[PDB]
């Protein structure tokens, strides 16, 4: 019926690169790898899934992974890696002294005055989830992962609204 695939988001070079790496881990040449190789082939390709991510991927699966499933796994993890990096860069934009912290006051301010402005209810929940009144934003990012300032603001608001949606259920 349909032709769409996550691999549509991959370049031809990536497909070839992922194919070479995958096959490098296929021992008996049956076109599949075992679940215990998944983490290592992903790392060999520059992706570092956490133990939880790996467990989630494996649960989606005779204990083997076929190539199209692997391409899908790669494409989805690459998307998450890119988003996570973008969220970190967006926070870094608002870290004026670059020390890895943002004041609760400053975070609340940029979230409500720039971009797709957070409501008082959204932002107050944000501050609650984020304080020692300093926000270690690296920790906040890891927690969410389970002008220049304008674009950065929207990155954070969309990331946070995504987190809120998941939490509402």
The end-to-end span amounts to 33 Å
Largest β sheet strand count, sense and barrel closure: 2 strands, antiparallel
Q: Which structural class best describes the helix and strand composition? A: mainly alpha
Number of strands: 4
Rounded to an integer in angstroms, the radius of gyration calculated over CA atoms is 19 Å
Order of helices and strands: HEHHEHEHHEHH
Shape assignment: elongated
Please, how many domains?
2
Helix content: 55-70%
H/I helix tally: 8
Q: How would you characterize this protein structure?
A:
Ca(2+) 4 binds at residues 132, 134, 139. By secondary structure, the chain is mainly alpha-helical. It folds into two domains: 1-82, no CATH class; 83-169, no CATH class. The protein contains eight helices and four strands. α1 (12-24) packs across α4 (67-94), α4 (67-94) packs across α8 and α5 (104-113) packs antiparallel against α6.
In short:
The chain is mainly alpha-helical and 169 residues long. It is built from eight helices and four strands. Ca(2+) 2 binds at residues 62, 64, 69.
